[PDB]
Ligand SMILES: CC(C)(COP(=O)(O)OP(=O)(O)OC[C@H]1O[C@@H](n2cnc3c(N)ncnc32)[C@H](O)[C@@H]1OP(=O)(O)O)[C@@H](O)C(=O)NCCC(=O)NCCSC(=O)CCC(=O)O
Ligand SMILES: [Mg+2]
Ligand SMILES: [Mg+2]
Ligand SMILES: [Mg+2]
Ligand SMILES: [Mg+2]
Ligand SMILES: [Mg+2]
């Protein structure tokens with residue numbers, strides 16, 4: 027019942043040996059085993075990667091072929107190669123969010139200056155910049171521990187209008203469209219076809235047929251329940267500029283412009299109120315703010331009733 | 334009706350599908366017959382002649398064509414035609430709704446847009462490994478619509494982050510799109526506007542009207558395409574699900590959906606949809622009573 | 631009175647307009663005399679000498695200059711001076727409002743920022759066709775302010791999407807700007823902050839304060855600049871049109887405008903502006919009554 031994983035990768039190391047990134051063209055799941063990354067011998071390097079190995083004197087970096095193995099996906103990432111493999115498994119949809127331990131990545135990953143000449147270390151970057159500029163403009167896409175998903179894999183059946191907004195480790199199921207205002211973090215994303223125009227925080231999962239409206243916030247700052255991760259089930263709709271700090275079951279809706287936090291008091295059809303966290307995971311709910319009273323209300327959506 | 338025509342440089346995928354077409358100089362014409370033809374050698378402009386070739390790593394080819402649209406009222410027949418329509422809008426030769434922009438999702442190819450040019454989704458991972466021999470491979474987006482500025486930069490405009498303006502967006506002189514603004518195709522401004530929020534496809538904003546940061550026009554669950562008239566202001570993080578006339582204001586943080594019940598000065602309420610298109614209105618949520626209300630300006 | 635100086639690599643348009651200047655190592659100096667001069671050959675640093683030249687396709691030239699600002703309290707006189715000011719802020723040599731950042735819009739050239747370097751608006755469509763001989767032509771933006779990280783990467787910082795930080799933003803160590811974060815010029819953080827919403831020009835956020843996803847901070851109090859003190863939290867999709875002192879919270883989804891009438895624990899109401907700069911406040915919209923309320927935090931009671 028323990029599953030492992032393995033992949034041949036092209037890793038870029040900084041001048042001090044720090045792992046900046048690793049691209050695995052064909053990761054795969056394997057029987058449980060022993061975690062380690064090794065340098066591949068010449069005869070084991072796929073021909074497509076052999077042409078990509080080298081040293082960049084201006085960036086002071088080297089690109090090397092490795093094989094990374096994870097003994098158990100339940101274990102925490104040991105090092106950055108292991109971290110990059112786990113992120114690739116998610117974005118390749120070989121594992122769904124929470125199907126592997128995605129804990130502790132901030133601590134294991136290197137902060138990288140991502141440029142139009144490849145990953146660079148922070149250390150010595152201003153001298154690197156001046157050297158690279160002999161080649162043409164130096165553009166820095168971002169400075170962060172997580173790069174852009176699409177620079178490692180483009181999953182099929184998917185559209186991403188502005189790929190700055192999908193981190194490697196995001197899981198986008200076939201039929202998903204991420205629009206310009208959409209954002210998907212690592213260990214997060216969609217299980218089926220969703221229009222994603224709002225923000226899916228790390229660990230958040232959105233079920234098949236559910237749409238996230240423009241500017242909508244799922245599990246944002248001050249949204250509530252610190253501890254447990256929230257998810258939304260199937261056929262849910264979050265209105266534009268809405269927010270959500272509790273899980274939703276199937277067939278729920280949050281009105282445009284409404285932020286439902288776990289601690290928000292919600293008035294029910296019977297006139298009683300509960301904290302929204304008491305509704306977390308329920309189905310068939312519509313949340314709105316009454317435009318006459320200003321009260322946050324929840325209504326049943328199927329003609330049946332809340333519970 | 335009016336037709337259009339233009340000479341374009343198209344990129345075809347390995348299977349012949351049209352990935353994109355750049356038309357440096359589209360123009361309007363008398364009505365005629367829709368068709369795209371490959372240009373003969375003597376008809377290729379000299380600026381474009383150096384750009385034609387085949388890319389063996391991407392498995393694509395770039396070719397010079399002339400696309401004619403017989404009538405701007407017809408639906409786009411093919412991707413060349415679709416690209417020509419989007420160029421007419423961004424060139425401001427045609428205003429939103431000034432041509433038929435329906436059916437494009439169905440006509441346009443889903444494209445992997447890269448720092449090496451457009452690529453097909455099919456065989457992309459093998460293409461990526463081959464291109465990496467040239468340097469890093471960066472994918473800007475995977476979608477049916479590219480970035481307007483990569484085809485035309487219209488005059489009198491600023492766009493702080495050009496990832497946020499689709500080809501097909503119409504931005505009148507004096508318009509500034511800030512980093513949080515977004516303008517879809519067949520949509521945009523007719524005059525000078527500060528755009529820091531989201532203009533959905535089909536939506537037009539009149540001269541002098543400003544869209545505050547994070548504002549949503551016609552977003553999901555907001556409520557016939559809507560439009561904003563002249564000298565309006567949508568507050569930051571606000572939303573609009575109805576049309577506004579001239580001189581309207583929506584308070585920061587308020588979402589006026591078509592189904593929102595609004596209290597008028599006399600204490601009577603109405604659904605906001607009944608006010609659609611009115612001028613001189615201020616919408617706010619009263620911070621004391623909690624009620625969405627409208628005031629005269 | 632403090633001045634500043636820097637050797638820079640300037641790119642000029644075909645008509646001589648300054649498109650940008652990159653200053654690798656700006657420095658503060660004694661009060662002095664403002665001027666930009668072309669460096670003689672012997673004064674060009676070896677790393678910049680290799681970068682000087684003329685681009686015939688773009689119709690631009692890159693030149694080595696030294697720019698001196700006589701007094702940081704004076705308004706920028708021209709684009710070289712403006713770019714130096716912006717670099718002083720982003721290098722954290724000056725904090726926001728530590729130099730006069732007025733009139734920059736009027737001084738700076740509107741630039742087509744491309745993967746081939748800065749280009750002029752003038753004649754750009756022909757330039758694009760020539761540059762496509764080299765490969766794809768990607769336009770990042772068309773604006774007077776370029777992306778900070780293309781001039782300096784400050785240490786101790788993360789920026790998930792660097793399209794969203796203008797040159798002139800001041801990001802103190804421990805700062806993370808996430809994809810939804812935005813930081814304008816003459817604005818930013820004084821210490822460690824998680825920034826996932828929008829910091830307008832002139833706006834400063836104190837050590838340990840976090841700006842939630844999609845939150846909106848207005849630049850001024852509808853003419854006093856808005857700031858946030860230490861340990862404040864703005865919830866996702868919230869908005870702030872008044873200053874906050876320390877240890878304040880604005881609830882997710884609530885926009886506090888200067889004119890909003892807020893009800894207080896004693897049930898009297900004030901305009902929110904009357905609370906501007908106070909500490910220990912929590913603003914929320916009551917989910918039963920619809921009213922915007924302010925609560926005292928941590929038994930601290932409330933000061934106007
Ligand atoms: C609703 C308005 C438009 C009101 O404008 P005014 O100029 O009247 O402001 P004012 O003088 O403060 O308000 C007039 C009177 O109404 C009262 N008042 C105001 N709002 C109220 C409310 N919701 N309920 C009850 N009373 C209210 C005030 O106390 C004052 O009372 P007295 O009668 O007693 O005097 C404003 O508060 C607003 O929302 N503006 C938003 C601006 C905005 O977002 N601009 C977009 C660019 S900014 C941006 O994009 C942000 C950065 C970013 O997001 O990136
Ligand atoms: Mg069910
Ligand atoms: Mg970008
Ligand atoms: Mg946004
Ligand atoms: Mg610190
Ligand atoms: Mg204090």
Ligand code: NA
Nearest residue numbers: 201218219234
């Ligand atoms: Na399905």
Ligand code: NA
Nearest residue numbers: 190494496793
């Ligand atoms: Na971007």
